[PDB]
Design an enzyme around this catalytic site. Structure first.
Site, mmCIF file in Angstrom:
data_model
loop_
_atom_site.group_PDB
_atom_site.id
_atom_site.type_symbol
_atom_site.label_atom_id
_atom_site.label_comp_id
_atom_site.label_asym_id
_atom_site.label_seq_id
_atom_site.Cartn_x
_atom_site.Cartn_y
_atom_site.Cartn_z
ATOM 1 N N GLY A 1 1.304 -1.219 0.286
ATOM 2 C CA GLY A 1 -0.164 0.291 -0.553
ATOM 3 C C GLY A 1 1.297 1.155 -0.281
ATOM 4 O O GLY A 1 0.367 2.749 -0.684
ATOM 5 N N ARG B 1 7.221 1.928 1.596
ATOM 6 C CA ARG B 1 7.759 0.951 1.891
ATOM 7 C C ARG B 1 7.925 0.371 0.430
ATOM 8 O O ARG B 1 9.187 -0.470 0.806
ATOM 9 C CB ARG B 1 6.988 -0.322 2.472
ATOM 10 N N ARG C 1 7.745 -0.944 12.165
ATOM 11 C CA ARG C 1 5.911 -0.967 11.583
ATOM 12 C C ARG C 1 7.046 -0.281 9.868
ATOM 13 O O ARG C 1 6.715 -0.881 8.818
ATOM 14 C CB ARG C 1 5.160 -0.285 11.484
ATOM 15 N N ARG D 1 0.969 -9.670 -2.890
ATOM 16 C CA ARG D 1 0.755 -8.686 -1.927
ATOM 17 C C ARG D 1 1.544 -8.745 -0.845
ATOM 18 O O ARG D 1 1.346 -10.113 0.168
ATOM 19 C CB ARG D 1 -0.124 -8.515 -1.792
ATOM 20 C CG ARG D 1 -1.199 -7.320 -0.779
ATOM 21 C CD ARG D 1 -2.449 -6.705 -0.377
ATOM 22 N NE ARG D 1 -2.611 -6.801 1.006
ATOM 23 C CZ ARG D 1 -2.409 -5.661 1.405
ATOM 24 N NH1 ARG D 1 -1.226 -5.178 0.486
ATOM 25 N NH2 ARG D 1 -2.525 -5.218 2.880
#
Lengths: 223, 222, 231, 221, 222, 237
Positions: free
Chosen positions: F26, F30, F221, F93
């Site tokens: 998303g 990243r 994260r 994904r």
């Protein structure tokens, strides 16, 4: 309320985002509109690549932000803006394909209500069919402004779909129902506004007939 | 087309019902509006009780008609008027119970949009959720009049229910969604207007919490 | 419940309405049945033109009343009748369009059951699909009377539509499923009765044929069957 | 040209114009042994034994249908469309929703509420009501009355599950009893223009087969 | 546990049914597999005519029984097996019709997922669309087996229909569904809900455009 | 694979510039980190809407990485184009997810063999029943093998593609044994099936949706998604 800022999707602190946000899907359009119309432009968000700027247009403080593609994408941003950042008014601006055969390219469509495929409604446990409408005050000022600057407009029903690429042919029924143009975001915006008791309006310029800065000026007059 | 008039539900001949119709549920209330506000009154319909009158209000010819109770009933009437009798504007008037706690009695609610239970939406084979909206121009003209004539008004979302008497309570979610007031007719009218490319507005007076003043607002839109 | 009488839709006081009410959509048809069949007639309601009369037929007290068109309309009246006015039996008597091709204009249709477009079943919060049925005893008594008087009748399923004018063609699947006739009120009445533990029956005369060339005073034979069911 | 089927072993003619079905192959074999003369097995496949015999003169077949609406669906369709069956009477045990029903009472399914079956296969643009054939219904009530048996006639509910609080609204609506099969049968018979009835003996309460077997057999023609 | 055995559908005492059950609709296939592949054969159930057998395959305890036709039917047995008999694996073995044009007759289809007509999903009160999947481990083990023995197989989505006799196959075919049968989805749901293991495998018997299976299945004995 | 339709309004890449395997996340940040970290000979092919996309090499094999935005309609647009215009064979994904299953720890990989969902675009496929969205089995098996061999904590089963971020409807999902919640899988799975290509959605647990609700440290994260990337990368062909 300010306690929940920043959010996982927005790096801005409370107060950093104005009471009127204009939103488009494209970060390039958001970056442009800011550079084009606003003095004292300050970037408040870059999280998720979704840029947000605050600045000045004719005295009033004003913010711009990207919302990405689809009801769930705008759904997140709108929710935070209204419920976390004290935003009073959101006007979405973007492109649309027309179902109404009388529309010409570059015409401005004002989304009074939005039809939609299923998105958020099941989260509200609503025991019937819920109609997504824009704020009337906003809708009225856009019509006045549109008729002042002499732009060809059409005010009425639009459809927030989940697909860009239809597998079959589904545009038929909407067309018969008098739906004006197709996009993918408005209905979730309206639902979220309604629930927040806040102001929201979706405005579209026709980019594909299914039979650009002019719109921005109308939007800007609404801040 | 004039060919299809009279209908099984309306005994009027084509041309007899003007281009603006003001509708309400109660035939007695319709007769009051006619006897009160209209000159040169002529009755065009008496079929099934649903009375209809054509006359004059400040120069313009104008008709008033009853629609019974519930979406299928206003459905039948609104369809004939738009599709057979060449009517271009229907402004509906009635009373409503308020969901919005900020409303006072005698307030006028303007139905920008209408939530609803299923009626004959399935008759239109809509591959998704359809939103019933009023004509904007009419809506603005009423909001203008309310702010001109100095009356307490709210404009926004309403709910056309299929029941008057609930089993349990279902008003909760609607109130959470900002629905302003509940009635039983608007959604079908809006839906039928949209399909014909015609004008429709539903305007409500608050009678319950969950009159003459409103009639004038309507009459100013013809 | 004497407390809720009169209602916003009915100006009659408790006890002014009989224990059996016959209902039609048309207020003019109601006024006829009262004048033709009943003695000692009292008008009990004029509210919204939904005329209601109480009288006697062959010694037995009964009421007759207009319901207007559509399920929500009958829904309002039936609800009050069963729950506020102490009514035991409602028999609806109306016109209907024939789906079944062996039915002829003038034929009586007895609705043991009713398919429907969504009315207020979702308001009953039903976790599945509810089949709306008439009272068996009334149903039986109607067939017997029709048999004894020798009128052509069918007993089966009917369809309560929310629309009069089809925006296309939806009748096909119904006709395949053995549905006999279409009308606009029954399912809501059946549902409300069930919930009240009272008795409902909807009887129809075929006034329109929804097949073939569409061929569009005879309501009298049906009124007699309905009237015989009054207790 | 259609008999036999991949679920029913019999060739055309081996099954009478009136069939009676139960879930349990024992109740089916019992019914034959108890009330029928000249009994012959027509079906053995899937273990769904079918029997053809005579009750008080008239030809009559008895058969198992397994559990659930899809199962009864298969046999009922086959019976009505390939075998020329005119009358199907289901006889079952069921649990009572109605508080006033006592154990062993007969309930006659004038109507059947349902969980989704294969209504979706019929392309029905609205809610369809599953009703019994009125005639069989009238005959069974008369038979219960003449024989002096306790019975109630109304609505039943054909569930897709045996083990569950999905019942409150059903109870609220005056539904008499729950089983798993009636609705599909009602649909198929309707669709085929033939006759069907589901009768139940109350075996459980949610709050004497012989007597019902008798009412049933008087429906044979 | 113990106080629910036997049930009103299954006549077996607790313990009389092994930790791995193999199920089929045709009670003939059930007896044959036992007679073909199992040692020390003992029958447990006879109620409803649903024959059940416990024996040994290559030195591990294994049971085989019938489930009748339809998701409600398998629902009953799978439920009882999982919740009262302490079963840990159920592997259904059956026949099915091919949707996928590339499937040849006799080919093995392994049901990684099952599309479905409404069963008793409504019973779980699920606020969205639920996807019925197989247990991954059994799924992966069956492929390894199909490979090692070199039999023709495909793994993918199947459709558990409510009807045997119909033309609603088109959209299913478009979606790449491999084959249709009548039981798998409900089996997956009950297993999932009970945190136990389930797989449906099918031999293609019809094209809509058994021993080789049994060995693959039995290899899942544990 | 239809060269005529490239570039698209959402993707500025010409045909042939996107590899046969695309890995998707998303966040555009990243995606760029994955490219800078694991790929060589990197070329950027898209910048449209900030949906950054890069093509490079990992241990000799060409592959692409690309931002997909948030939500099923968003992934829907990209996956559709990649599968149907760019000749893509494999889309994996790789995202964050909240844990529904109580035995899952922050850091655990979840392999979405299946995906439950709120209505996205199944109604546009005109499907006359309930559709179960599944991953490609081979990709699935390859991800489990890699995780087991590399010794990372993983669970394979059902996930839930929600249409909302801000909700207590989670309970019924939990009882049904759903492992984790995210927002994209079901649409990707749906689109792959219809295209006859391969999709898989892999997740790292960043939030626990039970107990005290411990969420990952700000570092993790952006830094503890490593192990999942290594698994995903090994699936490239």
């Amino acid at each position: 309320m300010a306690e929940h800022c920043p959010t996982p999707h927005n790096g801005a602190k409370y107060g950093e985002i104005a009471e009127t946000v204009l939103m488009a899907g494209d970060p390039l359009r958001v970056k442009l509109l800011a550079d084009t119309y606003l003095t004292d432009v300050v970037q408040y968000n870059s999280v998720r690549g979704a840029v947000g700027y605050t600045g000045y247009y004719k005295g009033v403080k004003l913010s711009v932000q990207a919302h990405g593609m689809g009801m769930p994408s705008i759904g997140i941003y709108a929710y935070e803006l209204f419920n976390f950042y004290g935003v009073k008014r959101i006007i979405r601006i973007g492109s649309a394909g027309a179902f109404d055969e009388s529309l010409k390219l570059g015409d401005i469509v004002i989304g009074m209500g939005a039809c939609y495929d299923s998105n958020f409604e099941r989260q509200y446990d609503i025991p019937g069919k819920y109609s997504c409408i824009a704020d009337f005050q906003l809708c009225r000022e856009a019509v006045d402004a549109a008729e002042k600057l002499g732009y060809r407009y059409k005010v009425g029903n639009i459809y927030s779909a989940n697909y860009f690429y239809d597998d079959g042919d589904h545009s038929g029924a909407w067309k018969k129902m008098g739906v004006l143009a197709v996009e993918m975001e408005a209905a979730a915006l309206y639902m979220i506004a309604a629930r927040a008791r806040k102001q929201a309006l979706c405005m579209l310029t026709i980019s594909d007939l299914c039979y650009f800065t002019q719109m921005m000026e109308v939007a800007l007059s609404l801040a």
